[PDB]
Structure formats: structure tokens, C-alpha cells
Amino acid sequence: MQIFVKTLTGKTITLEVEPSDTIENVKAKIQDKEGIPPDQQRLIFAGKQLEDGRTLSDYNIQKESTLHLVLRLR
């Protein structure tokens, strides 16, 4: 399963994912490709920011879906 993470600067992060890696893990997956500390992450889906401890299939994200990555200053 693959999902799409889009940044404001116009980058499309194709992730390799399975239905309920919690949102910590995907934020940890993002840290491994772009080096971004989760401290500074905000993930959005359908206009909703994904609280962690929860997870993907809970937010009903199937294949070929698009998410937004919004960066926080530290």
C-alpha cells in the first residue's frame, strides 16, 4: 500500500505503508527520508490533523490517497 504526502513547496512524498502503522510511525518514516524531527511535524488528511496514538485505517486512508505535511518552526 502506498500513500502520498504533499508539502507546501510542491513535493510529493510517496510512502510505502500498511493500513495501520500508527501516525507516530509514519511521522517516524518521514524523519528517515527527509530528516525532519517529528517535533516539527503536522500531518493533515481531509482537512483533519492526525493525532497520534491513533492510526491510518482509523482515518480510513486507502491506496493512492493524498495527505498534507505542514512544518512547524522550533
Binding site: 504533499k6 508539502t7 507546501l8 513547496t9 493533515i44 505542514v70
Partner: protein
């Protein structure tokens, strides 16, 4: 064809800069007292209370006003026909004295906020923004009246623009510039960037024409770079769902090759309105080659990367994190210097 200018400019006028200083010293530079994103940041070294709706944001809106009028004047001189108000004037007919009063109003437009709350504090926040503006004028009657504002009726007009109790965002040059100037600054954050750019473009275009509008958003990008704010990317082949900005909705493709229309205009779809099998949301790339969109939006087929050349995501983010961004958010002169530099940059060569 165009009103004689004072030599007036946001970057040299002392009155406008004084209002900005005042707005910062007494509001924008103070901690948020609400709770939505009210926590301050120590920009790699110093504090920024209101990173989103703060000093740099406010000054950018004022800078938008300066360039929008500049380009409106050039547009009228080209013989373009711009949208008119009830008194017959266009944005090209804004006087120097009027633009000064507008910018002063702009300086106070978000002073009344207590946090970054989106919705439920709108009236309260603009009332306190209005109150701040009136307090500043009262404390400076001696110098402001009649030399800047003709009288209390003049003062009241701009206090009402700030107040915005009825949302007459097109009633006057003051209304258009204060509201659209505030609005276009959201390009620094909104996604999908293609949807929002097309939207804001179409909001501004009737007032100043396509050529002038392009120059505004091209200049805006440099305003963002100069104030260490994020510059969005644009891809006309973006496959993510198109966002209908007004009402935050969608467009839908049915089983037909075609998109669903009313009776004709494209049918608005709410985010919570569930679909038929074999229907789908319209993608950004699909919306951009819509013939009605192609005709009104010249940047429909463009590809333009965001951020900075040679920097990767976290590198770019770290740049936006630097102490220099904090300096823009805390030093009126420094921020105006940056904006002035970006404003005139194309004119040096």
C-alpha cells in the same frame, strides 16, 4: 489618466511606519492571551509571539497594497478597463492620501486577535482591532487630524473597514485592499497551492487585470523570500483533488468522461456529501485545463518549483527557522527594508 503621486510610499512615509511601530509595540509584539497556538517561539535565539498573524504578516499586507495600486495605475495607462466602484473609481484612481489611510488601517487589522483561532472569535477580534485603531488615533489627534484623516467621519470609515461587521469586502478601494491584502498572504501556507493560487488570482484579477495580477504574485514570492516565509510550489500536473476554496468543497467526475454540472456551471460538492459508484473528485491537473480556467488563469499550465534552488525540505525549513525570520517579526525597520529590497529588485536590472 492617473492621479498625481506624492512621492508617497510605504517604505518612506513616516506616518505609516509610525502606525506599524505602534501596532507592534502595543499588540503584535505581545504574547497571545488566547489558547489556540498561543505559545511563543524562540526563533533559534529570540522570541516570536505571533509568527503567523504578526508584524511581518501585517507589513506584507501593506506592501501588497502598495504594489496592487502601482500595477493598477500601469494597467489603466495601458488602456485596460478595471472593475469600478459605485463612485466610478477603480483601484487605479486611489490617491496618495487615501493609500496612506488604508495602510494605517492595515497596520491594525490583526492587532485585536488573542490567538490564531480560525472561526468563532471573528467579530470579537476585529472589534478589538477596531478599538486599537481608534485608540491610536485618539492618542495622536494632534498630528493625524486634519493632516491625515480629514475628520471623525473619515476616521470612522476606516474604523468600520477594520471592524468589518457586514463583510462589504468590495464596497471601496479601502475594503478591497485591506481584505484581499490580508487574504493573499495565505499563499504562504495553503494547500493545494494550485487551487488557492487560481482562486486568489481570480479574486484580484477583475480589479487590476491579468498582467497586473501576475506581477503581484510574482512580487509576493520575493516578499516571502525576503521575510523568510515559505514559497509554495506549483505543478499543473498535480494529481491531488482540486479544492473549491469558496466553501471548501469539491468538483466531481461522473461515469461520463465529463465533470458534473448544474443547469452550465460546475456543481459544487460538500466534503461530507458521499458519492455514486464510479464518480470521483476532480483533480488539480483536470481543473487547470478546464477551458474556462485556461482563459482566466494564464499560469494554468506552468510548472514552478517552490522553496529555494539547491535546498532540500529540512534545509529550507531550517532557513525559515533562522534568527533572521525573528528579526523580520520583531523589527519594523528591518522588515520594511527587506520588503523594499524585494519590491524594487526587478527594476535594478
Amino acid at each position: 489618466s492617473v492621479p498625481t503621486w506624492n512621492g508617497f510610499s510605504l517604505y518612506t512615509d513616516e506616518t505609516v511606519r509610525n502606525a506599524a511601530r505602534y501596532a507592534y509595540d502595543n499588540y503584535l509584539g505581545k504574547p497571545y492571551t488566547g489558547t489556540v497556538e498561543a505559545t511563543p517561539v524562540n526563533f533559534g535565539g529570540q522570541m516570536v509571539y505571533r509568527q503567523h498573524h504578526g508584524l511581518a504578516h501585517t507589513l506584507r499586507t501593506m506592501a501588497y497594497a502598495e504594489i496592487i495600486v502601482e500595477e493598477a495605475r500601469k494597467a489603466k495607462l495601458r488602456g485596460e478597463s478595471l472593475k469600478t466602484f459605485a463612485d466610478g473609481r477603480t483601484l487605479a484612481d486611489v490617491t496618495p492620501e487615501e493609500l496612506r489611510k488604508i495602510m494605517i488601517a492595515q497596520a491594525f487589522f490583526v492587532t485585536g486577535r488573542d490567538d490564531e483561532e480560525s472561526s468563532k472569535n471573528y467579530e470579537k477580534y476585529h472589534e478589538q482591532s477596531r478599538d486599537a485603531f481608534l485608540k491610536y488615533v485618539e492618542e495622536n489627534k494632534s498630528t493625524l487630524i486634519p493632516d491625515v484623516f480629514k475628520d471623525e467621519k473619515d476616521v470612522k470609515f476606516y474604523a468600520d473597514v477594520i471592524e468589518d461587521k457586514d463583510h462589504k469586502w468590495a464596497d471601496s478601494p479601502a475594503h478591497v485592499l485591506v481584505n484581499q491584502g490580508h487574504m493573499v498572504d495565505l499563499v504562504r501556507v495553503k494547500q493545494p497551492p494550485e487551487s488557492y493560487l487560481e482562486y486568489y488570482f481570480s479574486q484580484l484579477q477583475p480589479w487590476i487585470g491579468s498582467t497586473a495580477t501576475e506581477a503581484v504574485f510574482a512580487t509576493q514570492r520575493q516578499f516571502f523570500h525576503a521575510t523568510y516565509e515559505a514559497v509554495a510550489g506549483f505543478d499543473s500536473e498535480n494529481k491531488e483533488p482540486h479544492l473549491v476554496v469558496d466553501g471548501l468543497g469539491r468538483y466531481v467526475i461522473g461515469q461520463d468522461g465529463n465533470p458534473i454540472r448544474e443547469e452550465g456551471e460546475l456543481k459544487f460538492f460538500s466534503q461530507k456529501k458521499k458519492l455514486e459508484e464510479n464518480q470521483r473528485y476532480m483533480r488539480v491537473d483536470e481543473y487547470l485545463k478546464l477551458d474556462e480556467v485556461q482563459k482566466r488563469f494564464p499560469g494554468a499550465g506552468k510548472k514552478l518549483d517552490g522553496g529555494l534552488p539547491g535546498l532540500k525540505e529540512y534545509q529550507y525549513l531550517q532557513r525559515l527557522n533562522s534568527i533572521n525570520r525573528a528579526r523580520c517579526e520583531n523589527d519594523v525597520d528591518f522588515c520594511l527594508g527587506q520588503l523594499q529590497t524585494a519590491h524594487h529588485q526587478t527594476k535594478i536590472t
